[PDB]
Amino acid sequence: TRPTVRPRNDVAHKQLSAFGEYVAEILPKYVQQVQVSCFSELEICIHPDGVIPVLTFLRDHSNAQFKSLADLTAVDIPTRQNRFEIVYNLLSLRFNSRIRVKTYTDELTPVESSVSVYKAANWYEREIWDMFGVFFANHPDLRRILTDYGFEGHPFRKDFPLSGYVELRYDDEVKRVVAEPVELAQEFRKFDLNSPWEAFPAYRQPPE
Amino acid sequence: LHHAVIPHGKGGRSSVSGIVATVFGATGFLGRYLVNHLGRMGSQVIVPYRCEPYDTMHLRPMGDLGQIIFMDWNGRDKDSIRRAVEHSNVVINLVGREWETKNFDFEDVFVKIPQAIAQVSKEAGVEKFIHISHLNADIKSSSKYLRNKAVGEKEVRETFPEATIIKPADIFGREDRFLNYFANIRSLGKKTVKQPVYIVDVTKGIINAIKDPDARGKTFAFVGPNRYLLFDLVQYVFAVAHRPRDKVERIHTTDRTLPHLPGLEDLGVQATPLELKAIEVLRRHRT
Amino acid sequence: LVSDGSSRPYRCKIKAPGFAHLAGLDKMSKGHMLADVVAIIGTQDIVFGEVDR
Amino acid sequence: PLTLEGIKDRVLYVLKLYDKIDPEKLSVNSHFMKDLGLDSLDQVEIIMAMEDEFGFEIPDIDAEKLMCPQEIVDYIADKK
Amino acid sequence: SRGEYVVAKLDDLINWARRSSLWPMTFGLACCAVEMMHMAAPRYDMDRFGVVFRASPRQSDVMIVAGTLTNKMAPALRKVYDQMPEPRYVVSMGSCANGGGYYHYSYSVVRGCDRIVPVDIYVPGCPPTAEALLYGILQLQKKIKREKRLRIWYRR
Amino acid sequence: TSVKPIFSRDMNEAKRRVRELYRAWYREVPNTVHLFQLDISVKQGRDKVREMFKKNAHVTDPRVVDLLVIKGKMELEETINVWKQRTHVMRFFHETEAPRPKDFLSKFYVGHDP
Amino acid sequence: TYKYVNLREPSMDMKSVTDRAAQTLLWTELIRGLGMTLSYLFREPATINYPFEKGPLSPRFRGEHALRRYPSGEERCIACKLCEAVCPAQAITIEAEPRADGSRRTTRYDIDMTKCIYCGFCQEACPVDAIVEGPNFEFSTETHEELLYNKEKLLNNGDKWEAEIAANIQADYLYR
Ligand SMILES: NC(=O)C1=CN([C@@H]2O[C@H](COP(=O)(O)OP(=O)(O)OC[C@H]3O[C@@H](n4cnc5c(N)ncnc54)[C@H](OP(=O)(O)O)[C@@H]3O)[C@@H](O)[C@H]2O)C=CC1
Ligand code: SF4
């Protein structure tokens, strides 16, 4: 097991376990999960009301500095009623550590626009609005950035299929470029690669 | 008939639609719009040219991937024309310079060209051959143009009798001749009553009639909706455009209805008037 | 990466330094002129491929 | 030349000047919305059209409170 | 027929004059632009062929569409195409641009730049190696060597 | 069941913001059809505007109405600037067919479109 | 460990401050730049005369998408669909049939040159080395119809040469 399989440090695991237990017990209003994976990167799973309070806690307090902001995407999971997952990803300049603040949300009710404490979150929340439609009340400007203007559909969902519905062509009839329903030249084949036979016995779920 | 001439599915962008069309011309104006609407329908178009391939290059990507195909024809040999119409569903004939050249008159393009192509066509077995004609091209006077067209009309009517001889009135559009001459002025003013017909209803009518069978044998004529004086129309052109010999004779010559033959209403296409599209097309004035 | 027990990844996403560096352009360029703005676009290395994610 | 009657006459011919109204059929109690077959869309069209005609801005709640020709004329008689 | 002979000789002179210099505009969306600037590099030349890389659109002979065309890109691309003198030619460089390419089955991508502007010369590659692009411009020049416009005008 | 809506209480505020948004589109139209050097009568454009409004009058759920109001406000912003070009504005229209009607026999000729 | 920059001050000593003033009023290091550029003038520039001299390469270039065949033998492709199973823009199109003999073979083996990003994956995935990325990269095709390979085009292109392909593989069948 030792050659060519990456060994690990339980020390970092114990440190993150204690730290997550600490954060969970000192902000008990919103914490439902603090989970620690095998390779010691922390995840905190949070109700969609403690967004501003928990991030104001996590920017400061001199026990968890974490100024640095990164990705925000809301991984589209059906077979839920709360479909979307807003994922903040935070980095400490002082402590060299990564915590994933996963808050959950539904289709139509907004989370509370983290740009108030995070000046990096402006185009991140604009991107999430453009690709998904997750609304952000109390925000300076929401537009469509990383899409076409006249295009709509919020394409990074699962309901939006791989091809777009519209497809441009120039035509000399009205001397300009128009959009048409999509006429593919080939099928985009679909390989049923989901093989059976239980490749991981540990991650089994109880059947009914 | 064999498969892959039958229509397939919805329309547009290499949906295999019905007609396989050999077009003589189409490097000019009306044939270019006609290839455009057949590309919207999704029809394979075989067009031969004769000029530099740069012109057919700037009208090339109208089709989808590899639908339309280009080859050569000449006004002399039946072998090149016959090779160009070896396999065709339909064929349309649209040709003509509006001045005599060194090597061609108004005679023998309008005379000699439909002769040979109809010869190899009727020996070839094409169907739904559509031959255009100028409206009111008579045996009567004032135009070698109009009388050679009348001779060609009698040719295409007599040999290969079930051709749709079609005639619009004199059309206007983005690349009109007579409205361009109205822009390329100076002046002189006469009287003639005249109906202008816009180009897109004409080419919509041509593609609808060529794709709809049972409407064959009959010559058709396309009608302008307004039908008023020429000089009032020139005042209209200067008003909308903000500024204060054969072509001018052949617009002063003849504009009338012919009550014998059926027009737009046997086709089901809405008439776009002069006013709407004329305001749309009169750009290129001062600011 | 977000992985189903699978051979297809369920969701990849990429933090791009181009996106993060284009993100603060007003507050980097409030007090200058346009050739300096072109120099600002230079001095943070751009590819514009990666700024799309 | 700023009375109730001159304002009502100019309101009357711009009621004539609107297109979809069929006919004008003026009354002090006309209620052109439902008794003449119109829409709240056309209600707000006519309200801001009167604004376009002769002056003051007529904001949202007062645009809702009118629904009626003479009530428009009297509300302008209040405001102007 | 020395009239026809003068026609052919003068057509050779004017078309050699066209194909001699041919300064392009580099439109250059994505990494195909990096390989084009690598054929602007000191090894693969462009001075030798009279080919002056130049961002001017107003005087563009040929136009090297390279990179990846998108739906947001396309009307601005064709507006760049319009303000351009009518003797003009197009080199579609790159698998992305000449047929959709690796982002073919996708939204926000026009399936190749055929569906916007006409294309004289396709050159494939990802990126088309700068050598191969230089071969593509040479075969563009040979297309210019066969164009016979003045032949068609005299016997027109 | 806890649902925290955007703006709405009943549909009165929905009606209020949507009638004001329609007023914004009414004074939006002639400036834009003059600015982009367009080629369509003002009557036709306004009637397509109110037709697009009258398409979605069938929804009473107020959160949906809030999100519609915010979408329409977004595109009124992006056409009241010059950020959208001629192409997108014409793309709202359909002047290129698109011919397909809902006749039974018409879809029975051009086959396999039930 | 860090080694930073810009930590000094302009020296107040009279020689150094009059030297910075001499550079300011005498345009000096600008002329130093001119001297460096003229040194690159007097070198010989490194160009390659393209249509004659061709720029160097590796034995493992990825070009033409050619096919191979057995020694005096039939087509090397079994039509085992691995290349279309791996083709990351799916430009392979394989429809397979047996023939009258019994050995399993093809019908339709199409490469799109548009979608083909030129990975190398279909070379590595091929169990019998049927498809090989070729050596030459000169396609330059004037029409878009002509950039859609058929199996017969691939066989002609595999029979316009094997000797290059065979030499490249026989040199470097030991790395991969
Ligand atoms: N208002 C109008 O203009 C109306 C016109 N028509 C008819 O419609 C037709 C099309 O009109 P339009 O497009 O305006 O005119 P064009 O001259 O542009 O159309 C004729 C086409 O055929 C080509 N052609 C003509 N003569 C020859 C020849 N001898 N050898 C080879 N090619 C030839 C032309 O030039 P090239 O060879 O360079 O391709 C062009 O491509 C004409 O026949 C006209 O009489 C009918 C009613 C109204
Ligand atoms: S073909 Fe390859 S090199 Fe060119 S733009 Fe596309 S991804 Fe980049």
Ligand code: SF4
């Ligand atoms: S992997 Fe090789 S042998 Fe198998 S189908 Fe593809 S080219 Fe043929």
Ligand code: SF4
């Ligand atoms: S190189 Fe890549 S894209 Fe091309 S055929 Fe092979 S696997 Fe497909």
